Design a protein around this nucleic acid. Structure first.
Lengths: 200, 57, 93, 79, 99
RNA sequence: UCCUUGUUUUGCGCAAGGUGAGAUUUUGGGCAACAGCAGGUCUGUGAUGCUCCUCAAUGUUCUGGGCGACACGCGCACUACAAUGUCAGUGAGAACAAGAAAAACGACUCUUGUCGGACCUACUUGAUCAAAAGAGUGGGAAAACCCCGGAAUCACGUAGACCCACUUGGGACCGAGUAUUGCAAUUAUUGGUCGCGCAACGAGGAAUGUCUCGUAGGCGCAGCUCAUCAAACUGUGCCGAUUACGUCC
RNA sequence: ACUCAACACGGGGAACUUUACCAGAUCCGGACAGGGUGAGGAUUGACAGAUUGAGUGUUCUUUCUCGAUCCCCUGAAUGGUGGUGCAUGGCCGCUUUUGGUCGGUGGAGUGAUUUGUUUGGUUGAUUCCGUCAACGGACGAGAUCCAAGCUGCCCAGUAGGAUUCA
């Protein structure tokens, strides 16, 4: 139908949101939602599992319950999972989290920025960027940027190599922007937008 | 009975462009949408897809 | 407003409660399997007070609420319902 | 938008707030007891109960000059 | 009715795995297949203003979804249908409407 | 690509012709660097710093009544309809378009864990006598129903009316009657027929807007908002040209 | 909101709602109890009459009916389309649809600097070519993407034709 799609859509939104927000500092990145008939299998993909799953499974069962009451599932029609996504550097969202945490704890600007860009480009990233806007020095805002490697910014091929993320840091005397980009060495399967190459 | 029957009534009838309120926030200004029965334009659609929408053209 | 006791019995054997943010009444599990029915505002008040006492852990997303209830929560409850427990998560797994 | 601060036309009798109107020892004013005859105590009532399922327990009616009333189901048997 | 399996999805290269391979079971493998196939793809198109306030030069965006639809036929299998269906359950946001 | 072996320096290319469904960014979009503006938004958000207000509140108020982009000498912006006889105007008959839209809301009857109806539209009746309305039945969850989607522009060897007039060109204002929408239509809400036309206006000064081919212009339909109402906006189709293909004033 | 980047714009065609604004009445959505309340407690709701715009227990009279968190007092919390867009995030518009931007190694100068990125031709294009102390890179341009025209394989019991017979 036209409708079944939109159901799955709005579901996937709300789901995503609630996890992204309330589950912090585990390096949350993605999920996936699928159904096998009469079950629902929702995986969760976050850098650090031991925080997600809880000490003996309290945390994961918690989330399960929450979901069920909202979207009106029965038990045994919903089950959740965790996974480690290792190579933390190659997720926007992961490094956005980490960077946020440091700025909230009264670390500087340039120090924090650099630390990210290190860990990224060691993981094997082609190039990355980081931005911070908002207060710094005092009055009349400011914006600054830190760049390493190289990246594309046009086409639809920067929408299949570069996935970005944006977050806030709430402080006294101002809000403070933050954003992190990160161009991957890989596509979502394979593809290169240009680069003709001769195989002998 | 008395005051309670006279408080919050005329839009638990549900009528007009009142008693809308978006799913994503709760704001009812700037059009809830009736178009394919989605809601997103009150938390703006520029901010959120994850519905499967993209600008291709 | 003595649907209190019912609400607290929905808590224990779940550890979790959820409700919409709305001024018009609706059942706050949408099904409990004990088929309780409560308003919305009444629910909201209960968990609000206990939150300020440190017994609750609150989460909001969209137009809704997700309520988790601490280790601390379990203590308070067991004394109010005059009942021991092995523990809430061990029974569930 | 914009805003200002001032509200007072005022200078009337304003409403008092409703406050409970107390009856003390309410049970003993309803149930009447007697001089003891035959060693058995005879209990009568000046309050008679309403015949509706809701009021079917112990729940009594009322007594005004020109009407009788039930505060439980909000009813009138008129005098 | 007859046995009509429909497959709907939000993208191509999802449908193709289900249909065009893994209904193999009914194909030449054990039994007859009458294969019809695929249907008008619909577009769901939501035009939306681009400015969060009132200023600008009155720009917009157009957003789109695609639906994809498929359809195949079998001439009364008597609960071979159990088998044939159940093997592909695969790919999130593909749904299967059997009649 | 090919050819003119023209032109060009052998170069980068350029012009004409050919080949072809298509001939030069093939055609129309989306995306888009670096450096910035003290542009807009605190009326988008459980996005917010500092302040203001807080039980006779600047909160909540889906409470009753009024006001809102609405109230009326007047200036300005954008839109739509005309001054008619190049379809031109009231009447008749013929042919004829495509993107798109609809489904679930704890009440109901079903058994033991779930059917039907709240949305569209067809046919029939109403109609042994206006419209608008009314009623019964049926289909469709959409490439099945609506739907062979009988659009309007348009066409006529229809012996149709009309005749250059502010006229049968245009209607603005204005009175009476009626039905539907809604909990509530009074400051007429929307349709639908009579009267008002003797109210303007007869191709428009200075000045000024954006356009190069399925384009300009003319014409109609749907989606959007949403009990009700679109001269708006977004999208699709029909009929379909004139001039230039140059320069720096 | 006010030249171009205000003025059928704020999805802003608002009867109520929406709604900020005006006249009037109502409700706590004041969490958290340190400070006060015997079995009645502190407390909730109301028919009738009156007040009132209100067959609105708002409030009073009257009596009945009920959790003791509800209730009383300070502190504090909260909510707000209140203020500040010259505190701030995000997003959008504009500068600017123009072809522009930057570093490495080498060369030249004691160096502020320059060459590369230049006189010429060419292209929508810092697009290429030629000359040449420059060579090789990264962004923008180009390319990758979406729709339209033609066509191959696929396909019909929701697409539509052909022939035969009555």
């Amino acid at each position: 139908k036209k409708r079944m799609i939109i159901r799955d859509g709005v579901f996937y939104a709300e789901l995503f949101e609630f996890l992204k927000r309330e589950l912090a500092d585990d390096g949350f990145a993605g999920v996936e939602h699928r159904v096998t008939s009469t079950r629902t299998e929702i995986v969760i993909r976050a850098t650090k599992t031991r925080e997600v799953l809880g000490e003996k499974g309290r945390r994961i069962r918690e989330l399960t319950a929450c979901l069920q009451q909202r979207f009106h599932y029965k038990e045994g029609k919903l089950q959740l999972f965790a996974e480690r996504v290792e190579v933390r550097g190659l997720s926007a969202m992961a490094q956005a989290e980490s960077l946020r945490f440091k700025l909230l704890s009264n670390l500087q600007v340039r120090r924090a920025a650099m630390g990210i860009i290190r860990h990224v480009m060691e993981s094997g990233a082609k190039g990355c960027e980081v931005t911070v806007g908002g207060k710094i020095k005092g009055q009349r805002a400011k914006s600054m940027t830190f760049r390493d490697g190289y990246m594309i910014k046009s086409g639809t091929a920067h929408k299949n190599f570069v996935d970005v993320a944006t977050r806030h840091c709430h402080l006294r005397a101002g809000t403070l922007g933050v954003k992190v980009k990160i161009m991957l060495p890989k596509s979502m399967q394979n593809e290169e937008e240009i680069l003709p190459d001769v195989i002998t | 009975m008395g005051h309670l029957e006279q408080w919050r009534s005329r839009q638990k009838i549900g009528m007009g462009k009142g008693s809308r309120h978006c799913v994503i926030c709760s704001n009812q200004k700037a059009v809830i949408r009736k178009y394919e029965l989605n809601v997103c334009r009150q938390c703006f659609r520029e901010n959120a897809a994850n519905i499967g929408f993209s600008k291709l053209r | 407003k003595r649907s209190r006791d019912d609400v607290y019995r929905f808590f224990f054997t779940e550890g979790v409660i959820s409700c919409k943010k709305d001024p018009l009444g609706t059942w706050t599990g949408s099904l409990g399997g004990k088929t309780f029915t409560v308003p919305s505002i009444q629910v909201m008040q209960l968990m609000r007070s206990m939150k300020s006492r440190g017994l609750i852990k609150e989460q909001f997303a969209w137009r809704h609420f997700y309520w988790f209830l601490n280790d601390e929560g379990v203590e308070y409850l067991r004394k109010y319902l005059f009942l021991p427990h092995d523990a809430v998560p061990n029974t569930h797994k | 938008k914009g805003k200002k601060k001032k509200k007072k036309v005022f200078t009337k009798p304003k409403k008092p707030i409703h406050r409970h109107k107390l009856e003390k020892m309410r049970a003993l004013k309803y149930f009447k007891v007697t001089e003891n005859d035959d060693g058995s105590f005879k209990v009568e009532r000046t309050r008679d109960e309403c015949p509706n399922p809701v009021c079917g327990a112990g729940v009594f009616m009322a007594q005004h000059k020109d009407r009788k009333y039930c505060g439980k189901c909000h009813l009138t048997y008129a005098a | 009715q007859r046995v009509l399996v429909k497959m709907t999805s939000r993208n191509a290269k999802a449908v193709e795995n289900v249909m065009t391979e893994l209904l193999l079971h009914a194909r030449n493998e054990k039994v007859v297949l009458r294969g019809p196939v695929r249907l008008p793809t619909r577009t769901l198109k939501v035009t939306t203003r681009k400015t969060p306030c009132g200023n600008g030069t009155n720009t917009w965006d157009t957003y789109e979804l695609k639906i994809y639809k498929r359809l195949v036929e079998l001439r009364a299998p008597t609960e071979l249908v159990k088998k044939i269906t159940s093997f592909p359950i695969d790919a999130g946001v593909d749904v299967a409407i059997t009649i």
